[PDB]
Design a protein around this ligand. Sequence first.
Ligand SMILES: CCCCNc1cc(C(=O)O)cc(S(N)(=O)=O)c1Oc1ccccc1
Ligand SMILES: CCCCNc1cc(C(=O)O)cc(S(N)(=O)=O)c1Oc1ccccc1
Ligand SMILES: CCCCNc1cc(C(=O)O)cc(S(N)(=O)=O)c1Oc1ccccc1
Ligand SMILES: [K+]
Ligand SMILES: [K+]
Lengths: 833, 835
Amino acid sequence: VKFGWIKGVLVRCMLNIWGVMLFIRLSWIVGQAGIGLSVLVIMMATVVTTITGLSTSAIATNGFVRGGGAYYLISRSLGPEFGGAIGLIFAFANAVAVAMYVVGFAETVVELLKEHSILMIDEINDIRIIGAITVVILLGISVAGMEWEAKAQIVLLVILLLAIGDFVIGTFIPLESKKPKGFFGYKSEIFNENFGPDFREEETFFSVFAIFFPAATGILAGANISGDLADPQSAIPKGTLLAILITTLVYVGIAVSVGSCVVRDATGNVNDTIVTELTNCTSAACKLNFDFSSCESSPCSYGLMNNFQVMSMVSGFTPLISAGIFSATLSSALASLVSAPKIFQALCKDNIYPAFQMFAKGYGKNNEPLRGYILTFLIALGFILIAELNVIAPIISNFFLASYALINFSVFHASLAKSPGWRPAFKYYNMWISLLGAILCCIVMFVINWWAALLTYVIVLGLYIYVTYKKPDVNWGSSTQALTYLNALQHSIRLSGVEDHVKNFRPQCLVMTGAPNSRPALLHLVHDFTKNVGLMICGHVHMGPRRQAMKEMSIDQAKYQRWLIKNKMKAFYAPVHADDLREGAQYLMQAAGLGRMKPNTLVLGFKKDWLQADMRDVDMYINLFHDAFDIQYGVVVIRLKEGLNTIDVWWLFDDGGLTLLIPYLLTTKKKWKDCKIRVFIGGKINRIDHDRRAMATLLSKFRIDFSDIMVLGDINTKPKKENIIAFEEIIEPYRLHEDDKEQDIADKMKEDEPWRITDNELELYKTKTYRQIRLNELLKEHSSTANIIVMSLPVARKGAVSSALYMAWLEALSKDLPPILLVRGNHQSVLTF
Amino acid sequence: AVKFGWIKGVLVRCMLNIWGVMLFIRLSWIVGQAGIGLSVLVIMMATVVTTITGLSTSAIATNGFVRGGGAYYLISRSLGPEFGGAIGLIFAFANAVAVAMYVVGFAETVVELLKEHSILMIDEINDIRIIGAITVVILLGISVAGMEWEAKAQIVLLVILLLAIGDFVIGTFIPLESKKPKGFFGYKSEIFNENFGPDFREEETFFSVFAIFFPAATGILAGANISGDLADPQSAIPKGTLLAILITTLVYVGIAVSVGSCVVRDATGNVNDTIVTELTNCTSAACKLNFDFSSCESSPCSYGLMNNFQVMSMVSGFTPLISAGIFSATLSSALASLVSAPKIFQALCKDNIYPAFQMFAKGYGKNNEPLRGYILTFLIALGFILIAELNVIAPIISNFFLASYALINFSVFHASLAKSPGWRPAFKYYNMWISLLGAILCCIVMFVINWWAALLTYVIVLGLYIYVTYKKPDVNWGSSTQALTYLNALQHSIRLSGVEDHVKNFRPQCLVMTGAPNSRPALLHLVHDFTKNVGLMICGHVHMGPRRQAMKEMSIDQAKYQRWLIKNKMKAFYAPVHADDLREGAQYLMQAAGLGRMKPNTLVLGFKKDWLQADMRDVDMYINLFHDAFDIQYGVVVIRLKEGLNTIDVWWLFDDGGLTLLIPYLLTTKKKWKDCKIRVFIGGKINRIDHDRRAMATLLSKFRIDFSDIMVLGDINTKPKKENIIAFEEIIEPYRLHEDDKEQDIADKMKEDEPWRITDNELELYKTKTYRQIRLNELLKEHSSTANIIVMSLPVARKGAVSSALYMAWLEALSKDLPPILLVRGNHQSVLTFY
Ligand SMILES: CCCCNc1cc(C(=O)O)cc(S(N)(=O)=O)c1Oc1ccccc1
Ligand SMILES: CCCCNc1cc(C(=O)O)cc(S(N)(=O)=O)c1Oc1ccccc1
Ligand SMILES: CCCCNc1cc(C(=O)O)cc(S(N)(=O)=O)c1Oc1ccccc1
Ligand SMILES: [K+]
Ligand SMILES: [K+]
């Protein structure tokens, strides 16, 4: 195993390219299109094949390649879905190409048998029998061992080269008996008259090019043996390119030699010699002592345009050329039958399609895919028993063009996504040359057949879609991921370019939910806005040992982010390590995001069970509120029923407009099309008409489309004493009965626990406590039925009120209601203009 | 000052702009050339495209105050400033030349009317020119009087037009015994059947007749162009525009169907023709009742739908009324165009998109009337009338109008696509798909009219686009472009968060901890070389002021430094924070900066040149920052340059993840260092130097680094020169704590009160290390003096093991009087794929 670059790559691919076209139809295409146009066709195929060779060389030299060849190269340089689609397409294409080569062999054998006396059953049936027998022999030689395959390849290569040498030496020497058939030894007049094209039949330049192109195919057999190769980096590039050079030179030289020696038209009748009657005919045959005037209006069985096997006749010892044709065709068939199962093996090993897994088995020491050999045997056998392959030839040609085109596109994509890790170490390549190769392959496959190209395109698209939806886990970093990163970075830079405006103010939320999966209810509620309308950073502070915490954080970021992706959530999980909530919250609030994608609101889940929890946590909560207010953030406190007349807005306190913007953003969603926002405001009595008119005008200026505005004048009134005593007994644990108890002891138990609610605080904020209690009462009795409630949260200066008192206010305001969403903004958010 | 409202400002203006020359002249032509069915189909196509245009402009207008300026403002606040400027200029020109088109149509009608008379001033074309000149002069004169002055005129003109319609209708429902031979019958079903199908006798085809018909449709935006003087555009513009479109298309279809059953296609005005008996071969509807016409294609025929463009006027009783109606329609359309163009051009001039034009935004008068814009439109119209050949340029102006409509629809589609607050049109009856469809049909129709005109319009719009986007003006109004940029950034960041991170796709994402980037440009340039198009550079900066006032200073700093970075070619994000000291702000940034997978993974620090002069607390904080970065698995990169202003060399002394080689390679992938060849220096004992070289080559063969040559040094472990160690001792002497040569108590107290001092125990423990860096410095000086960039693995020491003063002394000694050395240290995670 581990073949060298001469044997593994150069011999294998050089043999694969040389096939049926070289010794049979090359002369025919030279006849159909003149020497110049035939060489132009050969050079078109050469440029497409050369760009493909350069691209596959660029991909192959970028690090080790495990195996599977073209599939591995493309699937690692490009995404796994393109890799899988191309792997399946190319595997099937090579499997069919095995049948195509074998049926070419079989029809050559049938022709050699027809010119002899014997014939077995019939041309087509004998083709079927010969093809079946030969595919069985090919399967046997392939499963006998890859070393035996290599020996067969090299012996067939020397046979083919001897055949070409026989042809050229025969071309040097003319023979008197070959004159009637059309052979003259390098006559300049023949070259002159054959330089022009003459397409007597329906064939056109595009038709001849499409017929010739299959000759150029098969260059990836060098790369398709990547698994069993000593050093693909140094083997694939030089071997492939030199093989392309050698085969194209041979093709052009042979075509020019045949076109310059054999006449376009001629009949085998020896009685056509023109002797001493030099007449007024300017045809290139007249001046060469043989007048083939009959072929103008009579069918002749010889000449370039009529005879396919003129290459055999022109060369001395024509049985040797027949053996050469057999060697070329069988070698190409064996190369295809070896290339297809290996690429299929790699494709199934990567398990892009879980349906196909049995064919990845590694029977033998070299991991030979014997089941792949059987599958390719069956495909080739079927396509041979069909026995009529010319109908599907454009299909396979378009499969090959698709594979080459996506190799070129993989090079262009990997080079476009400027990233470390794309270091091919093949200097001779370019982004634009590869892109040109890709577009050239697409136009060529369209030229060959306009509907086969569409069929191939739709098949590739279908496989792409199927793999995308059936996304498997893939470790190999493709150029798609690099391009995603580069696009994200470029778009972020461009966003940093544009200045901010109050019209396009996006709510950018920093949700302090610890474990996102813990409380998905308010997570979805915060997702109702900040979905295609703003970003959503689900922060999370980690506590514990410093150095080791990163490991935990890493796995956490791996888990929760995945969870966010698993649900239809558009949010980023941004973890930090901090000693306490305030430190990590400050980390995030200070340096979260980048560019202009910075959070501007701190969405906080309401701290349920604040009574049971340690009071240090509650004071931490209130200090977090204050920190958010100090850094110019908009706090949003959300209270839900986590275990499990539509939307109400309470524009009690004026701010930039966040308390009104959020309800509107909630309305424009599929869950709540029927929004029907009911707006409320605290207006003095005997002014409700004026306040309602003014608020309706303002809400028309900001197009929010309320349902009906209501004005309340009872918001600041003494509430029912039952609720007052409920609030008092709720606070009772956190009271500071300084007046009742002795001054010294009260000071002692106040300084050690500064969160205690001084009676002075209660006497100063009795009005505010009544306000919150009354707001809760009137809201509960009025809007008991509603799907969302929004209100402006109360705010007190840091240290002015105890954390216990502030949390008591928050809890009393939203004691037991439908989902409530208290809001507070900083700067202007909604603009009439 | 003046506020018309939808009753007069919008409805009347667009009503009278849609109606124009063709409403009576060429309508017979289209209904005859194309059957009633095909004529109504063409009317439906024009009506639907104009209807989506009206819906889209209504959606744009209803969104907030539209201020004043017309379609320019609507398309410039809903879309980028450059699209706005381009369409403003193009639509202003199109309306200005439409003034001339309507004036020359009026002149054509007048010259034909007086050619019916024997009077002729000079010549048909000369008389057309003179009539057009007089009409445009008086048109300007009436227009300059005031915006309210036409208010009466328009409406009275309107009733005249409407009364003319009535005249035609009452003419349709009464046949006259004397005028049967001159084309029409008394509303017979035979005429309806005969004229139902199409008959394109001349080269005119379906597309040709559609293009002939379309110019009538245009004119809806003239109501929106009065947005400057209009009470409440938000509510007014939708009602006026939609009702005007509905009523004008209804009247068009009504007149088309009425004419389609009244006048035969071909009719020779010969009274002598008349039949008396039934005959076989007269399938023509003419013979059906009284009068038979024949051979109007083989002889010069006189009347008929497809011959006489004024046949409708003959059908209409009391031809003077319908003639006055034609004059009223064309003049009213001219007024609408000449009032729409100056206002839109004034709005274009106000925003200073094109510095060349500035005088047209004067708006002299209390009504803010652009008199200079009026004069410009007058000059353009006078010239285009003097051309007197408007058929050649008609496709150009039609395509201008169609481009305006198309990009209005696309403005709606773009604003709706960029899901954003502030896009609350409140006009329910619209749809983003409908707007996109309208734009596509506008594009297809402008291509269908004439391909060459469409190409000219497209390239002109693209040229204006490029000019305005290159000459970016001082504009900020949160256009849909900015909203879509934000939405694209967010969506792409989410997608990136979707994908995993691979070694093969590793990137150097640098957090450059250097405040005030302009302070240290050169350093950033070197950081930019290996982070441009390969990673993200976050130019961090901590704010040291008091907390209360720190926010405004931070905002000013961020704005001005982002503007500075964008002014240069720099591709970096300025991320400032506030902290009690440099270390805490660095911790903030290293813990939170960047969202998703776009977060830093290396910390780039400039070398502390003034560590000798500066207070030792800052240097200790510098080293503490080094250690903190190492704690969070960051890779430190210390860069030292000469701030006042042959190949690259690498020193892979210590094996890290692989950054030490990745940075030089990325440097070589740039035009600045494209020619530089990565020489490599490593450490290896003498007896196995060659093997080491071989090994290194193989390593650099696996990672395709493409070096030049490898030099193995085995002397790095040897003692350095005595002079160099003497210099090192002199350097560190001020920070020395001579505990060996002083009493234990004084040395101890100097230690705790001054913890950063270098105790002689550290010196005796790390003599080997100190000699290592001194030797490395001297061999750097002798071996790689002439090198553009030097890369070295910086030393590391455990926290507390070595004094920060001594560590900074090592950093100082490792690089003295050297080219731009670049010390590196990876985070022990492999960054070179190997596969
Ligand atoms: C993707 C091409 C698959 C290989 N088959 C191909 C090979 C060559 C050649 O010389 O390599 C020439 C042709 S050819 N002269 O165009 O017909 C071939 O098409 C065939 C052959 C025989 C039957 C039907 C189709
Ligand atoms: C590691 C937790 C970091 C975020 N903390 C957060 C987590 C969660 C949750 O479960 O994800 C719920 C709340 S809360 N207000 O109860 O809904 C939390 O706010 C706290 C928690 C304790 C002290 C102070 C504030
Ligand atoms: C886009 C609008 C251009 C204005 N002129 C235009 C107006 C109307 C109409 O109905 O207001 C009809 C036509 S027309 N004969 O139907 O194609 C017009 O093209 C003319 C007319 C006469 C002179 C030159 C050009
Ligand atoms: K081939
Ligand atoms: K018009």
